[PDB]
Amino acid sequence: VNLTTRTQLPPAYTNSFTRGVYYPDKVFRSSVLHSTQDLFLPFFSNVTWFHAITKRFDNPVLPFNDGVYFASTEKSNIIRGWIFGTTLDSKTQSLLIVNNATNVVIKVCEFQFCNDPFLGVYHKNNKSWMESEFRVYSSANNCTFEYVSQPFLMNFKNLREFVFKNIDGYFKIYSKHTPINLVRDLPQGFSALEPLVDLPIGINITRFQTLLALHRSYLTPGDSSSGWTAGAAAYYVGYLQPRTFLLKYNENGTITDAVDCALDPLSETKCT
Amino acid sequence: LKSFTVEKGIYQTSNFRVQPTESIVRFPNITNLCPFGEVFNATRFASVYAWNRKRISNCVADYSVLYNSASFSTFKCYGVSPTKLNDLCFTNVYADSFVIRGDEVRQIAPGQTGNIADYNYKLPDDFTGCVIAWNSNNLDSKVGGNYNYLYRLFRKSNLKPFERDISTEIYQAGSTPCNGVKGFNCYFPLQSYGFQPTYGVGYQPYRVVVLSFELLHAPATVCGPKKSTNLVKNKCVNFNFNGLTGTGVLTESNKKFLPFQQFGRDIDDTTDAVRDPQTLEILDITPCSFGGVSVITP
Amino acid sequence: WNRKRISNCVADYSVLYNSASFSTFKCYGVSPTKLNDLCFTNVYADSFV
Amino acid sequence: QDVVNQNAQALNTLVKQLSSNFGAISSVLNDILARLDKVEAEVQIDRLIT
Ligand SMILES: *[C@@H]1O[C@H](CO)[C@@H](O)[C@H](O)[C@H]1NC(C)=O
Ligand SMILES: *[C@@H]1O[C@H](CO)[C@@H](O)[C@H](O)[C@H]1NC(C)=O
Ligand SMILES: *[C@@H]1O[C@H](CO)[C@@H](O)[C@H](O)[C@H]1NC(C)=O
Numbered sequence A: 001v002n003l004t005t006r007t008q009l010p011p012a013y014t015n016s017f018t019r020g021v022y023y024p025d026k027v028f029r030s031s032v033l034h035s036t037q038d039l040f041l042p043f044f045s046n047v048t049w050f051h052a053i054t055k056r057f058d059n060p061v062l063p064f065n066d067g068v069y070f071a072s073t074e075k076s077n078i079i080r081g082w083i084f085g086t087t088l089d090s091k092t093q094s095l096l097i098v099n100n101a102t103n104v105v106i107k108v109c110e111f112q113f114c115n116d117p118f119l120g121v122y123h124k125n126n127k128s129w130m131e132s133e134f135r136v137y138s139s140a141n142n143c144t145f146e147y148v149s150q151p152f153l154m155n156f157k158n159l160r161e162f163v164f165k166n167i168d169g170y171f172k173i174y175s176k177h178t179p180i181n182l183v184r185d186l187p188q189g190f191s192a193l194e195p196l197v198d199l200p201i202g203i204n205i206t207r208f209q210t211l212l213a214l215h216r217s218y219l220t221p222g223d224s225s226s227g228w229t230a231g232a233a234a235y236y237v238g239y240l241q242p243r244t245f246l247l248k249y250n251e252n253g254t255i256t257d258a259v260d261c262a263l264d265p266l267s268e269t270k271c272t
Numbered sequence B: 001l002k003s004f005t006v007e008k009g010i011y012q013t014s015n016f017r018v019q020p021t022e023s024i025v026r027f028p029n030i031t032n033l034c035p036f037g038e039v040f041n042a043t044r045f046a047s048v049y050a051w052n053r054k055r056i057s058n059c060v061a062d063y064s065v066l067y068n069s070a071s072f073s074t075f076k077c078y079g080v081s082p083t084k085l086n087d088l089c090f091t092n093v094y095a096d097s098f099v100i101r102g103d104e105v106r107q108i109a110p111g112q113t114g115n116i117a118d119y120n121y122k123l124p125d126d127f128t129g130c131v132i133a134w135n136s137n138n139l140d141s142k143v144g145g146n147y148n149y150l151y152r153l154f155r156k157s158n159l160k161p162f163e164r165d166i167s168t169e170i171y172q173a174g175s176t177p178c179n180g181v182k183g184f185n186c187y188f189p190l191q192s193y194g195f196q197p198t199y200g201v202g203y204q205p206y207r208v209v210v211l212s213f214e215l216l217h218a219p220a221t222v223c224g225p226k227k228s229t230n231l232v233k234n235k236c237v238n239f240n241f242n243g244l245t246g247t248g249v250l251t252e253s254n255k256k257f258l259p260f261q262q263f264g265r266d267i268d269d270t271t272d273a274v275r276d277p278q279t280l281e282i283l284d285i286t287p288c289s290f291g292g293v294s295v296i297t298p
Numbered sequence C: 001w002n003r004k005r006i007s008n009c010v011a012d013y014s015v016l017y018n019s020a021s022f023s024t025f026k027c028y029g030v031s032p033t034k035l036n037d038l039c040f041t042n043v044y045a046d047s048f049v
Numbered sequence D: 001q002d003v004v005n006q007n008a009q010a011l012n013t014l015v016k017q018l019s020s021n022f023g024a025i026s027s028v029l030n031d032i033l034a035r036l037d038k039v040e041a042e043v044q045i046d047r048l049i050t
């Protein structure tokens, strides 16, 4: 489906306020100041922001340096999964991550990822609100992984965070959930990000592409190309760089402060 | 003092140190059996420029089957002595198998030179694994010469460790690329081996397998047949939690770990804890009686 | 076959590696690029048809 | 106050110097003993001692 009827605008940018500290190891430390080198989020950066609420459906092919801090000032679980490849045309394996309502699909397949994996159906007109459409691809070949997980039932409050380890064998994701509120649109503060999974996909990974719901009901007239509803959400994406950090752990064992020895001479003085 | 007479005073001499009573073992549980038959008894092996890789996790390892099967000479190890492989649990196992000629076996070493090292297979310098090869003529060499075994000869630059290149395109040695006409001044980077069973030992097909390990830091995934032991407390003993050996006293904790945390490390980065990888309880790990002795005399 | 001694000189093949009339420049071991970047000893050239 | 501070600083230097390869394979004595044949282990221990 060639879903058109969406406008062209330059990307959104905003600033990164120290929102990104991934506990780098399992060591239960506490009440210490463990200095440690680690690729991280360079504090304070005019980083981009694909701003997708005409109808503003911005979802271009985004490349992969090394990990993405992925915030969702949103309301209703639209952003779902992503692809992760270098050509994406079934000529190579690609990573695929899908997040349905029930299970996750991390299919490493030679798959021709064509069009958008949109969740249109949304039978709220028939009092059901069940969305289903699979244009995530066309074919699935030589897929060496798939993980049906525990089956679950699926203001602005879903600021996600997803450091993705380019180093294969262990695609760990550092994350937090946050009940965000007011329309600060990117809050200031400081929060932790424990590592999560570990996947020996072993592939050359290169380009993710967000997978999302579209709202299709009576109030959505017209052919597929334009017959949908947008729904308000916004997301921020950041890349990482190799830095050296100083962390400050409380008595409760929680990371509570950090210092980037690479921002100012004052900082560096502290860091020594 | 090296004398037979001592003056009034107090002189320090040696040190005292209780000794531990016993050792314990505390592992997660049990696995199954490693597929070494599948890796060492394949019908045919891959060619070097397309060497293969297999993952090993979640199985009980062994060595006596390798010693039980056909003579596997050239069994050399880096960062391990082969015998103690069975007495150590390792996570991250991978096995890469392929076939070459009998000569370029000398080239499989961390840090080397040659067509294979540069264009077909590179080992990391800090490679902490073990290489195993053997001649195979009753299997790979056929009277007409086996040509199914190929390799790469040409490339702009050398490979980085653990990389493979399956791309096939005419190399242009000189300038003015011929652009796919495959004329002279242009090379097909791949060639093939002739394996007539008449060349001699310097040209026999050798089957090679390399087992690569990764330092034990992340929770382990392969082990050996050592049994866990019951747990005892409040005695200077020899503990081994999941390959983490030590000797001292353990105590039940007051601490609070996040589900991804496991030990006590202190300012000097030394352990006082384990979460029991059977009961998942935090124990604080601490050395026992230390001291040096003084004697008073008139 | 004549075997000409070549010595006390520099072995510039600048008008050699780039000449068109070459058909069989079969060099073994020494890449024809670093012909200038590697040295040799007393040279002895077999000249003949 | 200065006297107390100076002394402690020097002691901390000695404590932290324990964790340093000193041109070997490991910092843990037990780990050097492990995954290594006696001969090689001995020369690696020798490095740490010096
Ligand atoms: C940041 O602001 C600069 C200055 O206006 C602008 O040119 C740039 O596009 C923004 N983002 C980047 C990529 O640095
Ligand atoms: C992958 O699938 C293609 C298409 O069926 C097939 O030709 C190829 O042999 C497969 N490769 C492997 C390794 O299974
Ligand atoms: C990953 O993909 C890029 C783009 O095709 C390529 O240049 C690079 O060599 C690939 N990585 C490896 C290890 O080959």
Ligand SMILES: *[C@@H]1O[C@H](CO)[C@@H](O)[C@H](O)[C@H]1NC(C)=O
Residues within 6 Å of the ligand: A250, A251, A252
């Ligand atoms: C740490 O835990 C204690 C005990 O539960 C609690 O009283 C305290 O609020 C927590 N946070 C800090 C910063 O002490």
